[PDB]
């Protein structure tokens, strides 16, 4: 369904034929809660500044091509080498450990739909969401058309069409020109490859304390005990760090690679072959009547995004430490078990030998000639590892507690909580809503306690005196301190 070519600002599109066209979603859910005291703001602003933004030429049109070019840039590795491909033996062998040596089996239809979630789009192209199309208990006549063509092609074991529908991603960022884009997944491609890869992530799932793909991790459980034990089992200096601009880099040999991987335990069937091709197909993506091409980059839209950008990370983490190990003329292997580390989509925390502490220069410099671009987690500094006591994950850090191990969200994504609400209605610049009585906000208040309360009766009093102003716009209480604070200890345990 690409016609004609555009030409605009460099950008490899061409008109949308075949199918109607999806104009993006203009503005922001969130608005400001009124009254909030300046001493609890943070800085974060929406990604769509909208007309608040000064720049009159920052449309939203404009402003998803201007990050859409960045897939169409040549990926970094046109080819893995061997210290990827020594990775790629070490996640086999972990994942037929893990399997026993039997392949998953692929879910039939009404097992591998249950998994999508109520709150999905379908796609580019079939309009709303899920719930719009399975209302009265049954599918409509759209949704069920268009999963009956796609299952059957799907079986027939020829490759669906790995287009998405673009978007600019609603979220609050720190007010610095890279925002992320959204890639709703058409519900097709979604349900076949619910069918092929749901067992084994859920097998991983279960478990992801252990690592190192940390998918499905309850960071208010016991599992932070295990991650934490497992990162200090081996050593006692550790790297965390940060990646800018990963899923839009990816080489694509690495994403394939990935996938195959993960494919390799599963039931070999026509449907499993299908999945596997989509996915591994350069990814396309409809913004409005324009449909745009990829040369790199992973879709957080694919089925699986969390996974499979999970095993990428393993590969490129432990081969930059391989290479850098071969430069010096030692041979080095198993790293996930001599060195334990996790791995979160773009996020990781490795436990470091002496000899990798020592080589970090050379692991930073060969992560760069990757393609990646790592970051201090700690978002000040420059990369160097720290003491336990000192790392990050998930955005979170930890302290040693009476009730084992507890994470702390920052402080700032606490704060803005106060700030900000993801309202019900878009909003074209930044500015104050109303709308506040709502029982997902004194949800998410409620729930703001308990992570205030792990960084202490000071910062939790705190967070509190403004949760009491904002009882007046919703209906919310406000606990104790040792009331939030036994909620963190029922948790755990
Ligand atoms: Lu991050």
Redesign the pocket.
């Known amino acids: 369904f690409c016609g004609e070519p555009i030409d605009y600002r460099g950008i490899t599109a061409h008109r949308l034929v075949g199918a109607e066209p999806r104009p993006p979603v203009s503005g922001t859910r969130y608005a400001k809660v009124p009254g909030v005291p300046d001493e609890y703001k943070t800085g974060y602003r929406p990604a769509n500044l909208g007309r608040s933004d000064p720049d009159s030429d920052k449309s939203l049109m404009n402003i998803a091509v201007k990050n859409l070019q960045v897939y169409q840039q040549e990926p970094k590795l046109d080819k893995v080498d061997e210290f990827i491909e020594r990775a790629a033996a070490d996640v086999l062998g972990y994942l037929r450990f893990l399997t026993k040596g039997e392949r998953q089996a692929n879910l039939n239809f009404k097992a591998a739909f249950n998994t999508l979630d109520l709150s999905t789009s379908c796609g580019p192209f079939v309009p709303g969401k899920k719930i719009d199309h399975v209302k009265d208990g049954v599918m409509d006549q759209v949704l069920a058309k268009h999963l009956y063509k796609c299952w059957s092609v799907a079986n027939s074991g020829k490759a669906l069409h790995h287009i998405y529908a673009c978007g600019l991603k609603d979220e609050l960022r720190p007010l610095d020109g890279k925002k992320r884009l959204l890639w709703g997944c058409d519900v097709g491609v979604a349900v076949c490859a619910a069918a092929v890869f749901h067992n084994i992530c859920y097998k991983l799932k279960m478990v992801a304390r252990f690592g190192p793909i940390a998918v499905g991790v309850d960071m208010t459980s016991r599992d932070v005990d295990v991650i934490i034990n497992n990162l200090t089992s081996k050593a006692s200096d550790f790297l965390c760090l940060?990646?800018s601009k990963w899923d839009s880099t990816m080489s694509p040999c690495v994403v394939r690679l990935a996938i195959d991987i993960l494919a390799d335990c599963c039931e070999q069937t026509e449907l499993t072959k299908s999945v596997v091709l989509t996915l591994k197909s350069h990814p396309m993506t409809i913004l409005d009547a324009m449909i745009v091409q990829t040369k790199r980059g992973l879709p957080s839209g694919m089925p699986f995004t969390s996974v499979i950008n999970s095993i990428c990370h393993w590969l490129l983490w432990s081969a930059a430490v391989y290479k850098s190990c071969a430069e010096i003329g030692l041979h080095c292997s198993n790293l996930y078990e001599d060195a334990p580390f996790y791995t979160y989509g773009?996020?990781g925390v490795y436990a470091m030998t002496p000899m990798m502490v020592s080589l970090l220069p050379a692991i930073i410099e060969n992560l760069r000639d990757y393609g990646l671009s790592p970051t201090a987690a700690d978002k000040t500094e420059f990369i160097d590892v720290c003491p336990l006591n000192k790392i990050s994950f998930l955005?979170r850090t930890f302290e040693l507690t009476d009730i084992g191990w507890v994470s702390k969200l920052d402080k700032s994504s606490i704060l803005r909580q106060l700030e900000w609400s993801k309202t019900t209605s878009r909003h074209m610049v930044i500015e104050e809503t109303y709308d506040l009585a709502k029982e997902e906000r004194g949800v998410q208040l409620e729930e703001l306690q308990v992570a205030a309360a792990a960084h202490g009766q000071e910062f939790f009093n705190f967070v509190c005196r403004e949760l009491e102003r904002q009882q007046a716009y919703t209906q919310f209480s406000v606990y104790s301190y040792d009331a939030a604070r036994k909620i963190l200890a029922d948790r755990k345990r």
Request: aromatic share 20%; no cysteine; proline share 0%.
């Open positions: 940060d990646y773009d996020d955005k």
